Design a protein around this ligand. Structure first.
Ligand SMILES: *[C@@H]1O[C@H](CO)[C@@H](O[C@@H]2O[C@H](CO)[C@@H](O[C@@H]3O[C@H](CO[C@H]4O[C@H](CO)[C@@H](O)[C@H](O[C@H]5O[C@H](CO)[C@@H](O)[C@H](O)[C@@H]5O[C@H]5O[C@H](CO)[C@@H](O)[C@H](O)[C@@H]5O)[C@@H]4O)[C@@H](O)[C@H](O[C@H]4O[C@H](CO)[C@@H](O)[C@H](O)[C@@H]4O[C@H]4O[C@H](CO)[C@@H](O)[C@H](O)[C@@H]4O)[C@@H]3O)[C@H](O)[C@H]2NC(C)=O)[C@H](O)[C@H]1NC(C)=O
Ligand SMILES: O=C(c1ccc2[nH]nnc2c1)N1C[C@@H]2[C@H](C1)[C@H]1CN(C(=O)c3cc(OCC4CC4)c(Cl)cn3)C[C@@H]21
Ligand SMILES: [Ca+2]
Ligand SMILES: [Cl-]
Ligand SMILES: [K+]
Ligand code: NA
Length: 806
C-alpha cells in the first residue's frame, strides 16, 4: 500500500528516497508503483518535444513544455539541449575540433570534476568500428579521449551480473548477482527479471559506487531509471541536477540505455535493423554533450561510455535439449539459455545423483555444443563457484547456441536472433570503454582490460577510498592524466632459509632409488657454485617471488632451476627456470626412468617419499623442472631430486609431460627464450584463494603429502621478441595457465588421441592472469624488474585469450 495522494510539485526527481506511505517522485517510483498521482503531469512533461525550433527562441516560458527555449532557461537549468545552437549561433559539441583538456575547466563552486557514467546494454566491441559512420558523437569521445579496443565483461556475460560488477569491482560470485535468474537456498527465495524479489536488498552484496560515494560525503544522482522514462527526459534530469546549488548537487551520475541490447536480441548483432538504435544512442550522447557545453561543463565533467557485454548470433534451431541426453529429465531444474545451471527439482529426493547427471552429458554426440562441469572444475579465470546461488552442475555452452531442458520449453515459454551469456573470453561478448574528460588522457589507446578494474578508477576519479574489491588498484593508472593511485608492493611476510648440505644419504628412508653411482676439481668447484646460486640470475629473471603469508620454506639452487621449497606442503611453492631459443630437448636416459634422489639439503622429515606413491594406486608423480630440459647429462640428476617431485594423476601426467616435453620448447622457439615459473595450487574450497593446510581434502595415501587441485605456469619473455628473454631491456610479455589436476581427462572429448590433438586446446581454455595465480598461492611475482610498478600491475592482470583479432 501507498497513500499516493500527496504531490510531486517541486519534488520532481528528488534525490532522497521517501519512506511509505508518503508518495514518491524519484526516477524509480514507477517501478515500485508508488509515484504521487501527479508524477506524470508535473515530472514527465512532453509538450513540444525535445528540441528548440527557430520560432521558440526567446519565447515566454510555458511551464507545460518538456524543455524551454525562453531567455531564462540557462539560469533555470532547463533549456532544450540544442537551445544555444538554434537560438544563439552556437555549434553542436560534435562539430567542434577537439582540444586537449589539460586541467578541469569548471564553474565556481565545483569542488571536483563530476563523473557521468553512460552505460549501454549489449554494446558489442566491434560496433565502434563497424557502426562508426553513424555514431559521430561517440566516435569523437573515443578518438579524443582514452579508449580500449575492447573491455572484457565478467562471466556470465548477462545484464545484472555485469552492471553490478561495474558498480562494485567484484566478481559475481562475491557480489551475489550470479545470473539474470537465480535461486538462493538459505533465503529459500528466487530472483527473477520480472517481479518484486529482485528489489530486496538481500540479493545485492558488496558496496556499489553510489554507496561508497555517499558514505564518504560525495553526493550521487540516483543511478536507476524506470524503463518508460524516455532517454531525452533522463538526460534533461541529469542536466537539471548539474544546476543544483553547490551543497545539493551530486558529483556522480549514471545514464543507462536499454539499446542496443533490446534490438540486438530481435535482429542479431549486425541485423540491418541495428543501424537505427546506434544512431539513436549517438544522438542521446549528442544531447548530453550539447547540454554540458551550454552549462560550460564540457571541459569539466569526466564521461565514461561503457557497455556491459556484447551480442552473438543465436537462433531457436541451435538449441541442445537435455531431454536428448537424460532419462530422468523431470527430476532436474535447469536455468537455461546461453549457459546452463542444473539442480535437483526436490531436496526430499535422496535418489538424485550429480555424478550420473554429469556422466550422462559428457561427450555424448560428436558435435555436442555444451560441456558439463562440476562448478569447482570450471576454468579458474571465470571465478564462478564460491556462491550458494551457483548450482554445483554447470553447462558451458558453445557460442551461438542455447541449452534447454525439453523442446516444449522452447515453443511454449522463432523470436530472437541474438543473445549473450557465454564465456567472457568470446570475441562476440566483448564490450566497450571510452573515458573522456580532464582526468582521462588525451587521444590515448590503452590495452583491453577487465570491467572489474573500473570501480577503483571511478573511486579515483571522485577522490574516494574504494571498498575492498577484485580489481588490482593501479593496473589502470595508465588511463589517467592525474589522480593516479600510487600502489606499492606488498611486504614479504616469510623470509626463506638457504640450507646447505646437512644430511647424509643413509639418513633417508624414503623407499626411493636412483641409478646414480657413477663418480676432478674442474667440475667439483663448478657444481658447488651452482648449488650456492651462481646461475641464479639466469633462471630467476624478475627476482624471487615474495611469500605473503607465514610459513616455513627453503630456497634451493640448481644449475638449471631455482625453487622455493615448502617444508609444510613438502613440495615447491614455485620452481623458476629459463629456456633460451637455442635450448635443446633430450630424453630421460633409460637407466634414470624411475630415478628419485634424496636432497641432502632437506631433512627426511620434510621430504616426500617414494613408498607412498608405490602404495597409492591412483596417484603417480611428475617434476616441476622437467628432466627433458636439463642443460647437460650431469645437470639432469638435479631434476630427479625428491624436492622437485609433485603428486600427479596418470591422466594428468599426459597433459603435463606434453607441456614440459613439447610446448615449453615451442614457446622458447616462438618467443625467443622463455622464463617459466611453475608450481602447485590448493583450492579445495573453490574460493579462488590459497588453502591453509587444514583445508586440504586429499593426501597421497598414507602420507602427509597434500594433493594439488591445480598446477600453474607463468611464461614470461621480452615484448620485443628481437631481444632474448634473458636480456630484455623493456616491457615484458606473459601467458599463464592454471590447469585442473584431474584423475581423468573427461573434459577433453578427444583425449583418446595423441596429446598433439587435445592438450594445447585444454591449456587454452585454462588460460589465466598472473594475478589469479597470486590469489591462489599467496605469492607476489615480478618483484625485481626495471619496469614501473603500475606497468607490472597491468602485466599481472593480462589474460592471453587465444581469440582471433576483434
Ligand atoms: C574478491 O574480492 C572480495 C572482497 O574483498 C573478496 O571477498 C572477501 O573475502 C574475505 C575472505 O574470504 C571475506 O572475509 C570474511 O568475511 C566475514 C564477514 O563477512 C560479512 O561482512 C562483510 C563486510 O561488510 C561482507 O562484505 C560479507 O558479504 C558476503 O556475505 C553477504 C551475505 O552473507 C553477501 O551479501 C555478499 O555477497 C558476500 O558474499 C560473498 O562472500 C561470502 C564470504 O563472506 C561467501 O560465502 C559468499 O559465497 C559470497 O562469495 C559478509 O556480510 C568474516 O566473518 C570472515 O571471518 C572468518 O575467517 C577469519 C579469517 O581471517 C577468522 O579470523 C574468523 O574467525 C572467521 O571465522 C569464523 O567464521 C567461519 C565461517 O562462518 C567459521 O568457519 C569459523 O569456525 C569462525 O566462526 C572473513 O574475514 C569477505 O567477506 C569477502 N567479501 C566479499 C564482499 O565477498 C574475494 O575473496 C576476492 N576474490 C578473489 C578471487 O580474490
Ligand atoms: O532490458 C533488460 C534486460 C532484461 C533481461 C535481459 N536478457 N538479455 N538482455 C536483457 C535486458 N532489463 C533488466 C534491467 C532493466 C531492463 C534495465 C535497467 N537496469 C538498471 O537500471 C540497472 C543499472 C545498474 O547499474 C548501472 C550502473 C553500474 C553503472 C544495475 Cl547494477 C542494475 N540495474 C538494468 C536493466
Ligand atoms: Ca581456497
Ligand atoms: Cl542467468
Ligand atoms: K601410484
Ligand atoms: Na576424454
Amino acid at each position: 500500500w501507498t497513500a499516493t495522494s500527496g504531490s510531486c510539485k517541486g519534488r520532481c526527481f528528488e534525490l532522497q528516497e521517501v519512506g511509505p506511505p508518503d508518495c514518491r517522485c524519484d526516477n524509480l517510483c514507477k517501478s515500485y508503483s508508488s509515484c504521487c498521482h501527479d508524477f506524470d503531469e508535473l515530472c514527465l512533461k512532453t509538450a513540444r518535444g525535445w528540441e528548440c525550433t527557430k520560432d521558440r527562441c526567446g519565447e515566454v516560458r510555458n511551464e507545460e513544455n518538456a524543455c524551454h527555449c525562453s531567455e531564462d532557461c540557462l539560469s533555470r537549468g532547463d533549456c532544450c539541449t540544442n537551445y544555444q545552437v538554434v537560438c544563439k549561433g552556437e555549434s553542436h559539441w560534435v562539430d567542434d575540433d577537439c582540444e586537449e583538456i589539460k586541467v578541469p575547466e569548471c564553474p565556481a563552486g565545483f569542488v571536483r570534476p563530476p563523473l557521468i557514467i553512460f552505460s549501454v546494454d549489449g554494446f558489442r566491441a566491434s560496433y565502434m568500428k563497424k557502426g562508426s559512420k553513424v555514431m559521430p558523437n561517440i566516435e569523437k569521445l573515443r578518438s579524443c579521449g582514452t579508449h580500449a579496443p575492447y573491455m572484457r565483461p565478467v562471466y556470465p556475460t548477462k545484464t545484472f551480473p555485469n552492471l553490478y560488477t561495474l558498480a562494485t569491482g567484484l566478481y559475481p560470485e562475491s557480489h551475489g548477482i550470479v545470473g539474470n535468474s537465480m535461486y538462493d537456498p538459505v533465503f529459500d527465495a528466487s530472483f527473477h527479471l520480472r517481479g518484486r524479489e529482485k528489489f530486496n536488498h538481500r540479493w545485492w552484496g558488496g558496496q556499489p559506487l553510489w554507496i561508497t560515494a555517499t558514505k564518504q560525503g560525495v553526493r550521487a544522482g540516483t543511478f536507476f531509471w524506470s524503463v518508460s522514462i524516455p532517454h531525452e527526459r533522463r538526460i534533461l534530469t541529469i542536466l537539471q541536477w548539474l544546476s543544483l546549488p553547490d551543497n545539493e548537487r551530486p558529483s556522480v551520475y549514471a545514464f543507462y540505455s536499454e539499446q542496443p541490447d533490446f534490438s540486438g536480441h530481435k535482429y542479431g548483432p549486425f541485423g540491418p535493423e541495428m543501424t537505427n538504435p546506434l544512431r539513436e544512442i549517438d544522438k542521446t550522447v549528442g544531447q548530453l554533450m550539447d547540454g554540458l557545453k551550454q552549462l560550460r561543463l564540457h571541459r569539466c565533467v569526466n564521461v565514461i561510455f561503457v557497455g556491459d557485454h556484447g551480442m552473438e548470433d543465436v537462433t531457436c534451431d541451435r538449441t541442445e535439449f537435455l531431454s536428448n541426453y537424460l532419462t530422468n529429465v523431470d527430476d532436474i531444474t535447469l536455468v537455461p539459455g546461453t549457459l546452463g545451471r542444473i539442480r535437483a527439482k526436490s531436496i526430499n529426493n535422496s535418489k538424485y545423483d550429480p555424478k550420473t547427471i554429469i556422466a550422462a552429458l559428457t561427450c555424448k554426440k560428436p558435435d555436442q555444443h555444451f560441456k558439463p562441469y562440476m562448478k569447482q572444475h570450471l576454468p579458474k579465470r571465470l571465478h564462478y563457484a564460491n556462491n550458494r546461488r551457483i548450482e554445483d552442475i554447470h553447462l558451458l555452452v558453445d557460442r551461438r547456441w542455447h541449452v534447454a531442458r525439453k523442446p516444449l520449453d522452447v515453443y511454449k515459454k522463432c523470436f530472437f536472433q541474438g543473445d549473450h551469456g557465454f564465456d567472457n573470453k568470446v570475441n562476440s561478448m566483448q564490450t566497450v570503454f571510452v573515458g573522456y574528460g580532464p582526468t582521462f588522457k588525451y587521444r590515448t589507446k590503452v590495452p583491453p582490460f577487465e570491467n572489474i578494474e573500473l570501480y577503483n578508477v571511478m573511486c579515483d576519479l571522485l577522490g574516494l577510498k574504494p571498498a575492498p574489491n577484485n580489481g588490482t588498484h593501479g593496473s589502470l593508472n595508465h588511463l589517467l592524466r592525474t589522480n593516479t593511485f600510487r600502489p606499492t608492493m606488498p611486504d614479504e611476510v616469510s623470509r626463506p632459509n638457504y640450507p646447505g648440505i646437512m644430511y647424509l644419504q643413509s639418513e633417508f628412508d624414503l623407499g626411493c632409488t636412483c641409478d646414480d653411482k657413477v663418480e676432478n676439481k674442474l667440475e667439483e668447484l663448478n657444481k658447488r657454485l651452482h648449488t650456492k646460486g651462481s646461475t641464479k640470475e639466469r633462471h630467476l629473471l624478475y627476482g624471487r617471488p615474495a611469500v605473503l603469508y607465514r610459513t616455513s620454506y627453503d630456497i634451493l639452487y640448481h644449475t638449471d632451476f631455482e625453487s622455493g621449497y615448502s617444508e609444510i606442503f613438502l613440495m615447491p611453492l614455485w620452481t623458476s627456470y629459463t629456456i633460451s631459443k637455442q635450448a635443446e630437448v633430450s630424453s630421460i636416459p633409460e637407466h634414470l626412468t624411475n630415478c628419485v634422489r634424496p636432497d641432502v639439503r632437506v631433512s627426511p622429515g620434510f621430504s616426500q617419499n617414494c613408498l607412498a606413491y608405490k602404495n597409492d594406486k591412483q596417484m603417480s608423480y611428475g617434476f616441476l623442472f622437467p628432466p627433458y630440459l636439463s642443460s647437460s647429462p650431469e645437470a639432469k640428476y638435479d631434476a630427479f631430486l625428491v624436492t622437485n617431485m609433485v603428486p600427479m594423476y596418470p591422466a594428468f601426467k599426459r597433459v603435463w609431460a606434453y607441456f614440459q616435453r613439447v610446448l615449453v620448447k615451442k614457446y622458447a622457439s616462438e618467443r625467443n627464450g622463455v622464463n617459466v615459473i611453475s608450481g602447485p595450487i590448493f583450492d579445495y574450497n573453490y574460493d579462488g584463494l590459497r588453502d591453509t593446510e587444514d583445508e586440504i581434502k586429499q593426501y597421497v595415501e598414507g602420507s602427509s603429502i597434500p594433493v594439488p587441485t591445480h598446477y600453474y605456469s607463468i611464461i614470461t619473455s621480452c615484448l620485443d621478441f628481437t631481444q632474448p628473454a634473458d636480456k630484455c631491456d623493456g616491457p615484458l610479455s606473459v601467458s599463464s595457465f592454471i590447469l585442473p589436476h584431474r584423475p581423468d581427462n573427461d573434459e577433453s572429448c578427444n583425449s583418446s588421441e595423441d596429446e598433439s590433438k587435445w592438450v594445447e586446446e585444454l591449456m587454452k581454455m585454462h588460460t589465466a592472469r598472473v594475478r589469479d595465480i597470486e590469489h591462489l598461492t599467496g605469492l607476489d611475482f615480478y618483484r625485481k624488474t626495471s619496469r614501473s610498478y603500475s606497468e607490472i600491475l597491468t602485466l599481472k592482470t593480462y589474460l592471453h585469450t587465444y581469440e582471433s583479432e576483434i
